[PDB]
Amino acid sequence: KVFGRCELAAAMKRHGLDNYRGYSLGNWVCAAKFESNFNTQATNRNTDGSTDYGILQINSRWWCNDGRTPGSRNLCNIPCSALLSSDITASVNCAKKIVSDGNGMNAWVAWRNRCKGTDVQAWIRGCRL
Ligand SMILES: [Cl-]
Ligand SMILES: [Cl-]
Ligand code: NA
């Protein structure tokens, strides 16, 4: 599913991401935009052979099992394919574990490089939340 900007803001808010660990909703929407262009089916392969899955491009090296990333952890205890669902619940619940692990949203390279220090509230401007 490809989300609209406000549709995804609303879904993330309902799933408890607004101000989760102090990150306002605009941060999460901005990260989703540049990680996946709001497409839950996005996948990208990494140089180390791991793969990034879903709207928040969660990596199979640490967070999910895709059956082809040798020696990887599965810290969200989910198959990586569950992260590609039109239902964002699994991606959100895993992202909450990621953002709580010490490095906050810096775990998402695109957030650090394209959202951090910008006016992220602009990503939810106009939405009825
Ligand atoms: Cl915001
Ligand atoms: Cl980047
Ligand atoms: Na959803």
Side-chain angles (χ1 to χ4, degrees):
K1 168 183 169 88
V2 183
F3 277 83
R5 174 178 67 86
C6 297
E7 186 184 15
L8 176 68
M12 286 175 154
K13 180 166 171 30
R14 154 159 170 263
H15 279 95
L17 278 183
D18 188 10
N19 294 330
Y20 190 84
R21 294 277 300 205
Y23 290 93
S24 66
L25 194 64
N27 282 285
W28 297 103
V29 176
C30 183
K33 171 64 181 184
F34 295 123
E35 290 291 351
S36 66
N37 209 13
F38 298 147
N39 182 6
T40 65
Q41 300 191 255
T43 60
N44 289 288
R45 194 92 190 255
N46 299 309
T47 57
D48 71 357
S50 64
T51 300
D52 295 347
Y53 295 84
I55 203 173
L56 286 169
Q57 288 293 275
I58 292 172
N59 189 344
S60 66
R61 172 74 44 205
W62 304 101
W63 304 105
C64 58
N65 173 54
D66 63 4
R68 71 169 195 192
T69 312
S72 69
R73 311 285 337 244
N74 179 13
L75 294 174
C76 293
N77 302 328
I78 52 170
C80 295
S81 59
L83 300 177
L84 304 185
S85 170
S86 59
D87 173 5
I88 66 172
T89 301
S91 289
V92 169
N93 288 347
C94 187
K96 286 178 179 174
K97 186 174 306 193
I98 296 172
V99 76
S100 300
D101 69 8
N103 307 127
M105 284 197 77
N106 294 294
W108 285 278
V109 177
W111 179 84
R112 187 166 45 71
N113 289 330
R114 306 183 70 180
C115 307
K116 190 181 187 175
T118 75
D119 172 20
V120 294
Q121 193 279 338
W123 287 99
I124 63 176
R125 203 156 293 155
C127 306
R128 178 166 253 290
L129 276 27

